[PDB]
Amino acid sequence: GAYKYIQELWRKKQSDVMRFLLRVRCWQYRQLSALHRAPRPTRPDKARRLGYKAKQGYVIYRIRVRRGGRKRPVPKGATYGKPVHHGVNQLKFARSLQSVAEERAGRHCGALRVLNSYWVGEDSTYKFFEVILIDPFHKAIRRNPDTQWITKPVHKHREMRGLTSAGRKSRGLGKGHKFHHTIGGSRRAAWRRRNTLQLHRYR
Amino acid sequence: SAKAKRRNTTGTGRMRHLKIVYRRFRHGFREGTTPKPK
């Protein structure tokens, strides 16, 4: 039951123990490159409850993403339009920094399949995420029925289509009165349905 | 430029390999067999 203790310990992120580990680890992650293959999960309990298994064909990558919002990439701040669209600062990006992290791992390792990721550190400038990827051609993966699903071509670049857990959170999905925007599967699916004129033969 | 996309899209050229795929598809991409000899 060690994973029970570790999970609870990683909930005390302002304790003396955990603050010391986060601070020194963030320092160490900061001296490496923005994309860096990790030898093992820094968080074995968090990794495994996100689908990671300790077998050949599962790999970890540590991604560093710059913190903060999204500046509008217009020259000299000119947007050339109406005042409603003059904003340059204080704009936010539609997707989380964790999702950006997974996309940067998924794009680099185009032959792997991103599964999930998790938080490992941050300072004022960077957030650090470890991404769980799978090699879809290792026979430890192809011959396991419980992981054959992610070797299918329909699961190529999940992180790049908002399919991972981090990515799908910015899509406004969910059941109930809070998520009417995406009835039909997505915002555009709801829009097309609500904006298509049904002209029946007999009308 | 829709006009520019149809000047150099798939089909405008030779289809050297794609049009043999279209023929092979109709027989399930069979390989390693021949019609029964005379």
Binding site: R201, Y202, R203 | -
Partner: protein, 53 residues
């Protein structure tokens, strides 16, 4: 998406089937439709059910 199709009420469609049948049993109307029925024994013309086979 021109409106190519028309709804006709069922009661009126059946009305139209009844008028067609009533007008089909009158020699004057059938002759006035161009049919050569000057020697048909009777109108309406009923034939035995053997013909169905």
């Amino acid at each position: 998406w021109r409106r190519w199709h028309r709804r006709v009420n069922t009661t009126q469609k059946r009305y139209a089937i009844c008028s067609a049948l009533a007008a089909s049993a009158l020699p004057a109307l059938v002759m006035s439709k161009g049919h050569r029925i000057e020697e048909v024994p009777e109108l309406p013309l009923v034939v035995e059910d053997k013909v169905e086979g």
